[PDB]
């Protein structure tokens, strides 16, 4: 650590950045739990309004329509991270965008007083449009103001923040506490108080010196903040580290989304950044802990909605286990970790799934199955991809890099989403194996083409990028 210290003014300034992290799991989750509640409110405005009620096509169509707007939404919250954090800074984007925190959860606050299932659709995508930014922003400001020896670390804070809001979410969601009939808008409606404490806390919070050193020239107010920060007057490693990256951005062109697909230094990165984001997704993470309290139901759990608040414990667990280990770890061997560990358990619950009826005792497999999938997700694939983009590239392209890597993330979230029933339909328990493929797959591509990033500068990085280009 050199002299660097773990100062108040640094935990402060990350703990506020993580509620829009717990923002992201929240909305993430949130919306499980209320279903039937929520199909009930669609049949009764369609037909308070004087139409016939909705066939069971159309109720499913709509509720797919409000789970789903919030992917589309922060497909495209998350790709559209360049237009803020350059313009108004890190600190400032976060602020600016609980305008939207604030209004999307009104519309979903609102909706059932409104009898309006379009202001329920339309609150799940400015939820979402916020969400995605966030997912972008909070990484970016995290990465960027860590001590580089515990950039992971503080880095797996924004997947804990996301953690424990599915847990909250999941918590609230039971029905003696906001998922009922009469206080499921509040359920939703909640997520405005995160946004009006982080929009509270946020101006206390210092901006990134390396957004104003590199991108603002203002070195001697980096270094002032810097020195706050990290709680020591010695900071001339990181200042020289952050005045090499100001030069090399000064040489090289404004970063696009597109150029980060030309050139050969930013291709192995970019690649890296998406495929990991991938490897997070095309696990079948959501899949997995949305269907857990069917799947557990049908290994005879007798209240599988404690099961899947269960699960929700143990993803909270094991992103704290992450969080301890992935200085001393590294990034590559937590992540192939994640990855292996869930390759076993998806299979296991193929096998267990295809044997349960015919042998007594598979039942408990199943159960078991689920539970450390989930545990190995949360030692790597979990909180690893979320920051990992943030340290693969320097300062001029981390921007559209981080927009791009996001943005894959949604996407291939929302097409886990749109594709798994049917798959599943066609497959049956075999459908799990999928996953296993992409997990095996992606834990070969970890192996051989993903550097370790722990304790490096982004200068360190980026060089022996451009080195292998060359
Ligand atoms: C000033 C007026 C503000 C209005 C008053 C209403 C405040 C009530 C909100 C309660 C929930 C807030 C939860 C915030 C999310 C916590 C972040 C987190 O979970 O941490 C992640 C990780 O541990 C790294 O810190
Ligand atoms: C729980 C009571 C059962 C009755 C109601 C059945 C639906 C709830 C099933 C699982 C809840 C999981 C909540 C934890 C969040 C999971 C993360 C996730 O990805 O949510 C899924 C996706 O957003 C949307 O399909
Ligand atoms: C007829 C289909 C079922 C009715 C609607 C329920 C499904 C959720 C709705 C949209 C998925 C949006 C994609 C992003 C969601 C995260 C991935 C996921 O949760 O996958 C499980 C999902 O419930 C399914 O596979
Ligand atoms: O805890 C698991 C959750 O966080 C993950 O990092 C993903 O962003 C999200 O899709 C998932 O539901």
Redesign the pocket.
Known sequence: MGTQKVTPALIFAITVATIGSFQF?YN?GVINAPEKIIKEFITKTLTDKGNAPPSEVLLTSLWWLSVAIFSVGGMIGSFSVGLFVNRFGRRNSMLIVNLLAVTGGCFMGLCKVAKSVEMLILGRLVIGLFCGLCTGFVPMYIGEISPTALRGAFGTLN?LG??VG?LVAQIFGLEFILGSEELWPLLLGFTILPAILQSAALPFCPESPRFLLINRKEEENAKQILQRLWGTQDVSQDIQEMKDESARMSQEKQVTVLELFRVSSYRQPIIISIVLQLS??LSG??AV?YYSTGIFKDAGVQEPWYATIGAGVV?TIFTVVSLFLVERAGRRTLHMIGLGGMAFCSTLMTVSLLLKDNYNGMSFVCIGAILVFVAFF?IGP?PIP?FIVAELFSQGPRPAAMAVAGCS?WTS?FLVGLLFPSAAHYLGAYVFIIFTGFLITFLAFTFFKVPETRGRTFEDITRAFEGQAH
Do not use: C, D, S
Request: glycine share 12%; proline share 0%; net charge negative.
């Open positions: 799991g993430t997947q996301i953690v599915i997070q997704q993470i959501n802990f993803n949360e979990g979320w993330n979230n």
